[PDB]
From Swiss-Prot, chain B:
GO cellular component: cytosolic large ribosomal subunit
Gene Ontology process terms (BP): translation
Protein name in the entry: Large ribosomal subunit protein eL37
Role summary: Binds to the 23S rRNA.
GO molecular function: rRNA binding; structural constituent of ribosome; zinc ion binding
Gene that this polypeptide is encoded by: RPL37
Cofactor-binding details, from the entry: Binds 1 zinc ion per subunit.
Record-stated family: Belongs to the eukaryotic ribosomal protein eL37 family.
Length: 120, 81, 96, 50, 126
RNA sequence: AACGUGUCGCGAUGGAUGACUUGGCUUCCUAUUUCGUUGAAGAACGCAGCAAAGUGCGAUAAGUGGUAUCAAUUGCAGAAUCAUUAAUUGCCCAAUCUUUGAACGCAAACGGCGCAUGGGAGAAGCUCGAGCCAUCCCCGUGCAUGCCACAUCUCAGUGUCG
RNA sequence: ACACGAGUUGUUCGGAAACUGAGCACAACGUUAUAUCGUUUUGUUAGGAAAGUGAAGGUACUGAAAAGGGGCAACAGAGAACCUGGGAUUAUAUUCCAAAAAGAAAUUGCAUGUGGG
RNA sequence: AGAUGUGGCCUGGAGGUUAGGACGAAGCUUAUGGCGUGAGCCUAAGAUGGACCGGCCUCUAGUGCAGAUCUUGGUUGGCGU
RNA sequence: AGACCUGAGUGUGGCAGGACUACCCGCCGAACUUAAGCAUAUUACUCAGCGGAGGAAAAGAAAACAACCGUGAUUCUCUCAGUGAGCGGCGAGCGAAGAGGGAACGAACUCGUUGCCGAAUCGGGUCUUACAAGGCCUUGAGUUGUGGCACAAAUAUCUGGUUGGUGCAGGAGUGGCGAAAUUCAAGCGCAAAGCAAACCCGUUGCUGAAUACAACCCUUCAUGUGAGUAUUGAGCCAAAGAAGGUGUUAGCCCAUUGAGCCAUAAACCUGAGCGCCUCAUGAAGCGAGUAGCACUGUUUGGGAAUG
């Protein structure tokens, strides 16, 4: 979905981007305390990551990220919620670039990424 | 009465479906596809209607055996070692 | 032979006889006329339906009446012999 | 009429299946356009000549 | 139910795949009956794993049978009687084209005179 | 008076303008870039837990296999449970690939009918329920025509000879 | 209308397997710059070697006899072995009914058994 | 009829330059006035709008509508006939 | 009897058949139009029809130009030249060639013939890791001639190669995968705004006309401003300022942006990459229903005739 000059090919390759590209494209920055440790600027968000919203109207909420909805270009958190008309709660989705990764889940291919990103 | 009246004298069908062209253009009394020329080996295409030729082009179908070979040719006929 | 591939030889029954019908008049053919109803491979003979009913359900079919629905699917009314109970083999599958 | 080839019978068999309305849930797909089926049909108008 | 992991199938003998193939289908064709009278959705959504498993068992039987015949035809005496389906398919033109050997056939003269006067690297620089 | 006219405030009918753009047109470049009897292009039917169209796919049918990727897909239900041997998505080497079409066993508004050849099923009959299995049914392969080579084959001529 | 379920059952009914007709045009041959042209039933293709069948005989050889290739064209012509009864239906029936088939028949293929040759 | 002139008005864009805009851009509406002989410009108000955009020099063109039995979409009197 | 020649049947191995058709190559081939009418002419050796192929096709290796101090396959561009050429009811109109500046270019070769040889040839089996450019065999094809040697770039015939076949090796380009920098601080209708008039002063001083606005007027309660990609201030990255994403206008929120990293069927490219077995190797003639010629028709600038 690389930025081109042409903006017609850029927006096209961006919104027709398949799932895996949509995993990279929607990636949050991770907190300084996790930049110190892993020496990495930002990571793509996984399901269980615990994450803080910096961007808006929920600014300052903290939650566990139920699931990453890649079709709507959105993340679903815990404790980021709204009640419908009828009184049930529905998870309000937030875009990752507006959010901050405080605590990220670790699995063996997700570590092979952090070794592979290292700036040092 | 070349009419509404004689318009109800029309009975039967002069054209039925065809096997290759799949249209209603197959002539019955004698036997031809008015569109696909069936049963001639060679199809029916004329340069006086180009709008017509481009409904018969290689592209308009599923291209099933194009999709495969174009992928082999592009990949130079790879095999396992 | 240029076909190669594989022929199973035990599956030729499962392709012929597909799911049975629960419709109101298929259930009446069970209690009264001792028959089942199956959507069958639209390509099937009556002799095959007689054979693949001997394979799958191990019951002899004295009479078969094929039909082809307006939908393209080929129904069959299989009359299984009076030594056999079609209400027995039905509950061996479904039904209600 | 009663007569028909079987090849012709199936073409009307397919066209009878295609007349069903658009499922209710398929409206709810995210980013959905289709509302009502635009290819539906009635024998009284636009007659298949198969 | 569930599925048969593909590493397990490549290990088993042919008769053990045929033996297992059918009894997946019998559990499929017993699920077709459950699509008619419906209960258990939990039971009903199990039809994919059984279809693809049967797709997976046949995948092995076919690559094995396709493998064994390609070995079955090796000796050149036994070549050229090999089925059309086993022979390697190339575009119609490439398969009829002159092979890199037959286009390079050179007359006995052309070889003498391309030995007597080979092309030669040089530099005119200084 | 009533109708009708006129101005303003709001309101309807109607869908213009602007802002927006995964489209179009045209120009340019790269290359181990050119289909088909090993059944193509086009045609028909089908396939999804739910599926009309569209896309994908072919009885292994919304996909199998292999590598790379690294936790989804998502309208709903369903589902091994995170170290990859079962997420997904891209890519491709191994597969499958119905009915047809140059269509080619013969036909055709017929899911029709063959001749060889192997194979399956067979509640009659025979055999001691197993084994065989007539007629019927079923499945795979071969079989258009012309041409080229060939076999060290079988033949034709008041053609030329012995 | 619309929506949601269901409904079309055959040894004998109609077609096809298997007739020929006005006719059609595959092969063959000939034309044409080019077949996408013509001939192709007056008994019948083709300058034209298109029979794959086998009488009698000898034990799967020997060769009498048969001239004129393949196919399509009729749901009103030719051809065709089944009839009524019903409580068998929401909707099909000379199609369904099961031991007292409500029952009665017709006909094709093969096969054993008894009777004869 | 015709010829030409304008430091002459407008429009979509490109090279420059100078500015504006969520404290509200283009668009739109108005017994909103002001300026110019005029094409037009500009301000005011919107109980309009929701994100773009003006001036000036130069370049550029698919650049200015009332009429073609003009094209397309809509509406309308005739008519509750 | 058998052979040869001519011609059939069958088996075995294969191929032609349709699609695409922008460009290309053969044939066929018009009229509208222009001439102020119209018939030759023009439109045009174009549209339509038929046949065929490629990744280009066609052409091409002098029976060529020129008349010179001479050039040297073919194609293509500029120019020759809309021509003091030429064709034309000499009207409308039509219309090239050689030379020159250039693109390209390792660009050349083999048959027939003649002379010397005379089956050394080809196919099929089999064997050598092999359908070997190999050995053996083979009335199978072939003497009604396959093949070898030399003809002007010539002027005697008896170390080299990865383009002969076999099996192993490496680096490389090409494909695919992954791989940077730096941000806070002020909270709300109103200063999350200004002014100090080139630059400096300014790393400083000063401050608020919004006591809001909300519809006949006045008054009294009520209610109302989404998200900071803006503003102000402070700071930082730049071999990265790239232009896409995000709730407003983003170098620093994200993706990119770049030296490089791993993976790799064969081909491809490199002391024709590098080793190994076998295998090779430094007198006479020169194209016949052809060239011409006549008639006819056609086409061309080609005229007593270009094809």
């Amino acid at each position: 979905s690389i930025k081109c000059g042409s903006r017609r090919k850029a927006r096209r390759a961006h919104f027709q981007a398949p799932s895996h590209v949509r995993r990279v494209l929607m990636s949050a920055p991770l907190s300084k305390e996790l930049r110190a440790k892993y020496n990495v600027r930002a990571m793509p968000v996984r399901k269980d990551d615990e994450v803080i919203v910096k961007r808006g109207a929920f600014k300052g909420r903290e939650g566990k990220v139920t699931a990453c909805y890649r079709l709507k270009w959105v993340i679903h958190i815990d404790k980021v919620n709204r009640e419908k008309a009828n009184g049930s709660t529905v998870a309000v989705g937030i875009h990752p670039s507006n959010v901050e990764i405080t605590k990220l889940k670790l699995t063996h291919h997700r570590k092979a990424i952090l070794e592979r990103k290292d700036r040092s | 009465t070349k009419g509404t009246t004689s318009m109800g004298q029309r009975h039967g069908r002069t054209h039925i479906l065809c096997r290759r062209c799949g249209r209603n253009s197959y002539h019955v009394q004698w036997e031809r596809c008015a569109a696909c020329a069936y049963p001639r080996a060679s199809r029916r295409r004329y340069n006086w209607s180009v709008k017509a030729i481009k409904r018969r082009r290689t592209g308009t179908g599923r291209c099933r055996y194009l999709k495969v070979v174009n992928r082999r040719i592009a990949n130079h006929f790879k095999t396992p070692k | 032979s240029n076909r190669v591939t594989v022929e199973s030889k035990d599956i030729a029954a499962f392709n012929v006889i597909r799911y049975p019908l629960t419709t109101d008049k298929a259930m009446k053919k069970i209690e009264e006329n001792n028959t089942l109803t199956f959507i069958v491979d639209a390509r099937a003979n009556k002799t095959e339906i007689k054979k693949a009913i001997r394979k799958l359900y191990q019951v002899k079919a004295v009479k078969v009446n094929t039909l082809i629905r307006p939908d393209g699917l080929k129904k069959a009314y299989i009359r299984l012999s009076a030594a056999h109970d079609a209400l027995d083999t039905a509950n061996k599958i479904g039904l209600v | 009429g009663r007569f028909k080839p079987l090849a012709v019978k199936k073409k009307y068999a397919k066209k009878m299946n295609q007349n069903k309305p658009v499922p209710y849930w398929i409206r709810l797909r995210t980013g959905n356009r289709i509302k009502w089926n635009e290819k539906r049909r009635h024998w009284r108008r636009t007659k298949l000549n198969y | 139910s569930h599925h048969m992991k593909i590493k397990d199938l490549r290990e088993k003998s042919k008769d053990d795949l045929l033996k297992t193939l059918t009894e997946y289908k019998k559990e499929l064709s017993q699920l077709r009956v459950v699509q008619q009278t419906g209960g258990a959705e939990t039971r009903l959504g199990r039809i994919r794993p059984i279809r693809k498993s049967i797709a997976r068992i046949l995948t092995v039987l076919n690559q094995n049978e396709r493998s064994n015949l390609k070995m079955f035809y090796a000796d050149r005496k036994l070549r050229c009687k090999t089925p059309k389906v086993l022979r390697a398919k190339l575009t119609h033109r490439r398969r009829l084209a002159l092979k890199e050997n037959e286009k390079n056939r050179k007359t006995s003269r052309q070889m003498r005179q391309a030995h007597k006067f080979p092309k030669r690297v040089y530099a005119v620089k200084i």
